[PDB]
Amino acid sequence: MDVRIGQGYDVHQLVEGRPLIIGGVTIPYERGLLGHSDADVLLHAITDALFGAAALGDIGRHFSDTDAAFKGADSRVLLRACAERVKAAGFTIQNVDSTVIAQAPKLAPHIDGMRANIAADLGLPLERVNVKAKTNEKLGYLGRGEGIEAQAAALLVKQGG
Amino acid sequence: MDVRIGQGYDVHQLVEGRPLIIGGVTIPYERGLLGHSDADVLLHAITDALFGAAALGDIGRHFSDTDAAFKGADSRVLLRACAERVKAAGFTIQNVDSTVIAQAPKLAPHIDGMRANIAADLGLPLERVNVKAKTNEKLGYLGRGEGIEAQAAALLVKQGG
Amino acid sequence: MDVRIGQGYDVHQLVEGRPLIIGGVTIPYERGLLGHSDADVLLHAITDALFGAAALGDIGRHFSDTDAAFKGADSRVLLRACAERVKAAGFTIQNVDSTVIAQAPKLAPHIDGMRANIAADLGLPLERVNVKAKTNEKLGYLGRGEGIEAQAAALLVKQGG
Ligand SMILES: Nc1ccn([C@@H]2O[C@H](COP(=O)(O)O)[C@@H](O)[C@H]2O)c(=O)n1
Ligand SMILES: Nc1ccn([C@@H]2O[C@H](COP(=O)(O)O)[C@@H](O)[C@H]2O)c(=O)n1
Ligand SMILES: Nc1ccn([C@@H]2O[C@H](COP(=O)(O)O)[C@@H](O)[C@H]2O)c(=O)n1
Ligand SMILES: Nc1ccn([C@@H]2O[C@H](COP(=O)(O)O)[C@@H](O)[C@H]2O)c(=O)n1
Ligand SMILES: Nc1ccn([C@@H]2O[C@H](COP(=O)(O)O)[C@@H](O)[C@H]2O)c(=O)n1
Ligand SMILES: Nc1ccn([C@@H]2O[C@H](COP(=O)(O)O)[C@@H](O)[C@H]2O)c(=O)n1
Ligand SMILES: [Zn+2]
Ligand SMILES: [Zn+2]
Ligand SMILES: [Zn+2]
Questions:
Q1: What does the entry list as the binding residues for a divalent metal cation (chains A, B, C)?
Q2: Distance between CA atoms of A78 and A64, rounded to whole angstroms?
């Protein structure tokens, strides 16, 4: 088994006037993430971990502002597209694990929805997808609720068939 | 062989009047970590990584306030119970690696004691457990000594036989 | 296959009067990283991830500023020495992935040069080395351009022959 590791990072500012969408789940909340389209910090981090494991670069290098195929793409579309490219490069996905750091709101009741979304987008059963939530103990911009961070890890095997 | 990756994160505030306990090792110091029980930032991060690798959620999901069987539990008990559940889920542990970010004090003389505690609670030989230490170059709440961070990574195998 | 995971972290201050050297690549910029020698945040993070995976401790414990054999060693010499120690411990490197978090300058056109330096230094083909770049969305010291962080992950196999 030619096994490979990938890691990903993302962060977005939390601001008034926007919906909170994490792992494709809309979480009712006074504020939301700032960025293009749905600003899905968790989906972006996983997308980068998968591209990383496959030595395919990063989410920026694959998905430009001018790319014709992804005009009006949101984060789930990019995640499905990433999955396709990783497959096409000759890899299979062992599993994904992740952590979202948000001081608030509480994410635990929404985690299973995030798992179902990610598993579908990756062609994985639920048992190979995991998402964990953590506060930042009121430390830093994350602790102050100025932002939300996601960390991801992915393991692939290059077939190798 | 069905290999799986997990990653974990923890952080605690560093305050007056608490002992500093990291990797189960009490380290002489004028401040210590805040949180329930012993606030062992490093064991918590390793625990989350193991649960993540097993797709079992996170520490918070497993170890609540109201569980009869774990009041009185400190971080080593939780790490041992985590190991038991990972084994009960059908997995074996390949190894763990980690980093503790603290501007001070020096952790290097205490690292081997941390490794031995962790290997014992996970039933691993020392040679499969690693702990590393970093400062934060005087940047951020970590660099100012307002908290301590731990990062961890675990690799399991779903047996598989 | 006796597979093992490693993870690494580094951060350095960004200051006037220093070159910006990341992954062995000099990137013209008004500011550069503070630290001994070249202060190569990326190469240090990768070095730690590899020592971690082999359970050989960390970069600081291996490379003393007192060691005769490495005074005047820059970060590429350290990464090469690291690779050599990991080999003698009986390990082979599957792959390395990483992220550099810098608000600026743009790193994308320099990434392939970094990958080439890393692949050379580790004895790997380019296909097993990845480097990704992220801003910090103007958050925190990273966001304000006061430093640069690197994250790494490495996968080893203990021979196992
Ligand atoms: N310093 C930086 C930061 C980001 N980038 C590129 O910009 C893309 C978008 O990054 P952000 O999401 O941080 O805005 C990244 O995925 C990477 O391709 C870069 O090339 N240099
Ligand atoms: N809907 C989206 C979301 C993100 N992206 C690209 O994904 C990369 C990372 O996303 P963020 O900068 O929003 O974290 C960016 O380069 C952005 O251009 C995109 O092209 N379309
Ligand atoms: N935003 C957050 C942060 C934490 N949590 C849950 O709270 C539990 C403990 O979080 P902390 O260690 O950050 O206090 C986490 O393990 C997670 O289960 C959550 O559901 N939503
Ligand atoms: N002694 C302890 C320490 C932690 N825990 C659980 O571990 C979770 C994560 O730990 P921290 O919040 O202290 O990082 C907490 O939400 C708490 O429920 C516990 O139940 N008993
Ligand atoms: N709190 C700390 C921070 C660093 N260290 C040691 O110092 C060495 C260099 O650390 P820095 O690069 O963060 O300065 C580390 O690799 C580790 O060996 C330590 O033992 N305790
Ligand atoms: N040129 C260099 C760069 C780093 N090092 C060692 O590498 C470790 C990590 O480097 P930094 O503290 O500069 O991130 C330190 O212990 C430093 O002593 C070295 O000995 N020679
Ligand atoms: Zn994003
Ligand atoms: Zn904790
Ligand atoms: Zn460094």
A1: 10, 12, 44
A2: 11
Among residues 22-51 of chain B, which lie with CB inside 8 Å of chain C? none
C110 known member of a binding site:
no
Domains in chain C, number? 1
Residue B40: exposure state from Cβ atoms within 10 A (0-12, 13-18, ≥19): buried
Closest-CA residue of chain C to A153:
C153
Tell how far CA C101 is from the center of its chain: 13
A59 CB under 6 A from ligand 1?
Answer: yes
- Contact B133/B111 with Cβ under 8 angstroms? yes
CB B11 within 8 A of CB B147: yes
CA B13 to CA B6: how far, in whole Å? 24
What's the CA gap between C151 and C45, in Å, rounded? Answer: 6
Q: Which of A13, A43, A59, A75 to mutate to test the pocket of ligand 2 (most atoms within 8 A of CB)?
A: A59
Whether ligand 3 lies within 6 angstroms of the CB of B142 is answered as no
Chain A within 8 Å of C103 (Cβ-Cβ)?
Answer: no
Give the Cα separation of B98 and B115 in Å (integer): 10
Cα(C10) to centroid of ligand 9, in Å? Answer: 5
The CATH number given to whatever domain includes residue C90 is 3.30.1330.50
Find out whether C55 is annotated in a ligand binding site.
no
* DSSP letter assigned to residue B69: G
Q: How far apart are CA B106 and CA C59, in angstroms?
A: 14
Which residue range is the domain that position A119 belongs to? 1-161
Q: Compute the half-sphere exposure of residue C8: CA atoms within 13 Å on the CB side of its CA.
A: 33
Resolution (A): 1.9
Cα–Cα distance between C47 and C75 in angstroms, integer? 9
